[PDB]
Amino acid sequence: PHTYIKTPTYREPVSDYQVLREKAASQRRDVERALTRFMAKTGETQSLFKDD
Amino acid sequence: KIVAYELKTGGVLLHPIFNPASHLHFSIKHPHTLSWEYYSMFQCKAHLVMRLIENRISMEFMLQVFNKLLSLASTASSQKFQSHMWSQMLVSTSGFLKSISNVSGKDIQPLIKQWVDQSGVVKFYGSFAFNRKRNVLELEIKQDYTSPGTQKYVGPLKVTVQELDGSFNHTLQIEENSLKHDIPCHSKSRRNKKKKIPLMNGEEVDMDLSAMDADSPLLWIRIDPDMSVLRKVEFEQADFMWQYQLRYERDVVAQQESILALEKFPTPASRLALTDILEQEQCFYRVRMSACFCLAKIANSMVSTWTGPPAMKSLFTRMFCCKSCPNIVKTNNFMSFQSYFLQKTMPVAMALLRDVHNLCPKEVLTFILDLIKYNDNRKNKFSDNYYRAEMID
């Protein structure tokens, strides 16, 4: 059934609303955490705890 | 606000006569010696006393009084005579009462003498008993008139009784020596047949009469429903009467006072009443926002009895989350303005839940943190700052 005939295949698509909500949420949380840590490290900083 | 302030410190005296008020640490002869809280409560009491004058003399006559004052002022405002006529633009108390007496023929001098010249609010303590033999309702209304902020009321008093035959108003004459007021009660033939019980408005509803007493027809009682005096009422109903008044009343102040009085009865019927109020659109939204906090307090008081999940969580996932994912909140669409306010007030009350160890449960804290993480506001036409601020709260 493979000697002479060929048909194409595709990659597995993830159309699930749960995992898409999870992916968009975690990527937004991670990029805003990275942005705020970068901006707090390269400027004047405060701290709730002593030398934190 | 005013009964809290007047019972806290002395009282607000509209129209003093020149000290007239010596119970308070400043002089009321000039506006610049008044405390700022006294100035705020002064304006507040002034507009409530004007609502009382509208209650005695109807609203169209009141607007005619105001139009007569404005018309005298605007005929005065065009003259050139240096104040021969420019003082008709200045109102006084005697001129205001005279214009009221001109347009209506009634004078309000007892109402002015009680609520303006006298500086106090009244306190009502009511309790009822139903006489089954003579079919009467014996009310017992006593006043606390020896507190520092209080005064004694001797006028008439409206009371609204909802019985099975409908809603009936009664006027009671509360003289100084009065204590027991016997009002008559109607039939109970709407429990013989299942018929709908007619409400305060023209409509009628189906009520579950299993919680009601078998011998009494009366479903709830409200002392001074229209707020026609400056009063603080402490009525002693039964808990099922407070639940019926929360569910089937067509007055928002009675639903609010039943929410306020259901915190003393933590029975599961009251939890069912507040949960049915919370699920109910076509209830006024500020009643449901109060029922959130009342449900939180009741849930804290009946720990080691609570069966299922924490309070309002399943209701939040039923109202505001996705059907396929219960722990993922729906993307923000704030275009309804009543489920927006309820959505932003429900986790704030849900966070007041406490376990048997007095610590907030990790099921509600995790729920609030998932409400924070899965928040998506790229799709509504409104901002998210108040909802996120309430999430921090």
Curated annotation (Swiss-Prot), chain A:
It comes from the Eukaryota. It is found in: Nucleus; Cytoplasm. Disulfide bonds: none annotated. Induction: Induced with triglyceride accumulation. 'Taube nuss' means 'empty nut' in German. Ectopic expression of the histone fold domain acts as a dominant-negative mutant resulting in differentiation inhibition. Component of the TFIID basal transcription factor complex, composed of TATA-box-binding protein TBP, and a number of TBP-associated factors (TAFs), including TAF1, TAF2, TAF3, TAF4, TAF5, TAF6, TAF7, TAF8, TAF9, TAF10, TAF11, TAF12 and TAF13. Interacts with TBP, TAF1, TAF6, TAF10, TAF11 and TAF13. Component also of a small TAF complex (SMAT) containing TAF8, TAF10 and SUPT7L. Forms a heterodimer with TAF10. Interaction with TAF10 is mediated mainly via its histone fold domain while interaction with SUPT7L is via its C-terminal region. It is linked to Neurodevelopmental disorder with severe motor impairment, absent language, cerebral hypomyelination, and brain atrophy: An autosomal recessive disorder with onset soon after birth or in early infancy. Affected individuals do not show developmental progress, are unable to sit or walk, do not acquire speech, have poor visual fixation, and show poor overall growth associated with feeding problems. Additional variable features include seizures, spasticity, and joint contractures. Brain imaging shows hypomyelination, thin corpus callosum, and cerebral and cerebellar atrophy. Belongs to the TAF8 family. The TFIID basal transcription factor complex plays a major role in the initiation of RNA polymerase II (Pol II)-dependent transcription. TFIID recognizes and binds promoters with or without a TATA box via its subunit TBP, a TATA-box-binding protein, and promotes assembly of the pre-initiation complex (PIC). The TFIID complex consists of TBP and TBP-associated factors (TAFs), including TAF1, TAF2, TAF3, TAF4, TAF5, TAF6, TAF7, TAF8, TAF9, TAF10, TAF11, TAF12 and TAF13. The TFIID complex structure can be divided into 3 modules TFIID-A, TFIID-B, and TFIID-C. This is Transcription initiation factor TFIID subunit 8. It comes from Homo sapiens. The gene is TAF8. The chain holds residues 156 to 207 of 310 of the full protein.
Swiss-Prot record, chain B:
Expressed in all tissues tested. Signal peptide: none annotated. The keyword Metal-binding does not apply. Coiled coil: none annotated. GO terms for molecular function: chromatin binding; RNA polymerase II general transcription initiation factor activity; transcription cis-regulatory region binding. GO terms for biological process: G2/M transition of mitotic cell cycle; mRNA transcription by RNA polymerase II; positive regulation of DNA-templated transcription; positive regulation of transcription initiation by RNA polymerase II; regulation of DNA repair; regulation of transcription by RNA polymerase II; RNA polymerase II preinitiation complex assembly; transcription initiation at RNA polymerase II promoter. Its main location: nucleus. The keyword Transcription applies. One of its GO terms (cellular component) is nucleoplasm. It is found in: Nucleus. Changing P16H: In NEDFCF; uncertain significance. Keywords: Disease variant, Intellectual disability, Nucleus, Phosphoprotein, Transcription, Transcription regulation. It comes from the Eukaryota. The TFIID basal transcription factor complex plays a major role in the initiation of RNA polymerase II (Pol II)-dependent transcription. TFIID recognizes and binds promoters with or without a TATA box via its subunit TBP, a TATA-box-binding protein, and promotes assembly of the pre-initiation complex (PIC). The TFIID complex consists of TBP and TBP-associated factors (TAFs), including TAF1, TAF2, TAF3, TAF4, TAF5, TAF6, TAF7, TAF8, TAF9, TAF10, TAF11, TAF12 and TAF13. TAF2 forms a promoter DNA binding subcomplex of TFIID, together with TAF7 and TAF1. It is linked to Neurodevelopmental disorder with feeding difficulties, thin corpus callosum, and foot deformity: An autosomal recessive disorder characterized by impaired intellectual development, microcephaly, delayed psychomotor development, pyramidal signs, thin corpus callosum, and foot deformity. Belongs to the TAF2 family. Component of the TFIID basal transcription factor complex, composed of TATA-box-binding protein TBP, and a number of TBP-associated factors (TAFs), including TAF1, TAF2, TAF3, TAF4, TAF5, TAF6, TAF7, TAF8, TAF9, TAF10, TAF11, TAF12 and TAF13. Interacts with TAF2C1. Component of the TFTC-HAT complex. PubMed:9418870 was unable to show an association between TAF2 and TFIID. This is Transcription initiation factor TFIID subunit 2. The chain holds residues 401 to 800 of 1199 of the full protein.
